[PDB]
Amino acid sequence: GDDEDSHLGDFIEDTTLELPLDSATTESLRAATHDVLAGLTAREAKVLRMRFGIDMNTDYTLEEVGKQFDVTRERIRQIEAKALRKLRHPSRSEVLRSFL
C-alpha cells in the first residue's frame, strides 16, 4: 500500500481449509445416513456399510464381502441392489435430497 504497514503476505489466504458450513454438513450427512441405514434389514445395513466404508475402515468389493456372509458374489450384488432400491423410494429419501 501507500504505507509501511500492509504487506503482500497479509492478503494471501489459506485454501486448504474446509468451511465450517461444509464441515457442519458432513456431520449432518453422517447422521442422516445413520437413521436411513437403521431402517433396513441387518443384512442390508451391513453390506451397505461394507460396500461403502461407512463408520469403519476400507470399503470392500462384491467378492470380499462374499466370504463374510458365505453368499456368492452375484447375489450380494443383487442384495445391495435391492437395498439401493429401497432407499430411492419416498418417505425415506426426502431429507437425503436436500444434500444435493
Partner DNA sequence: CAAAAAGAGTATTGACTTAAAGTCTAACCTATAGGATACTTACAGCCATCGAGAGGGACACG
Partner DNA sequence: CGTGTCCCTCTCGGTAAGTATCCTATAGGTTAGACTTTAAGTCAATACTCTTTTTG
Binding-site residues for Mg(2+), in ranges, read: 94, 97
Amino acid at 73: R
What is the Cα–Cα distance from 100 to 96, expressed in whole angstroms?
Answer: 8
Helix 20-38 with 44-51: angle, nearest 10 deg: 150
* Residue 58: contacted member of ligand 1N7, another protein, DNA, none (CB under 5 to 8 Å, by partner type): another protein
Q: Is 1 in the site for ligand 1N7 (CB under 6 A)?
A: yes
* Residue 50: contacted member of another protein, DNA, ligand 1N7, none (CB under 5 to 8 Å, by partner type): none
| Residue 26 backbone phi and psi in degrees, to 5 | -65, -45
Q: Is 38 in the site for another protein (CB under 8 A)?
A: no
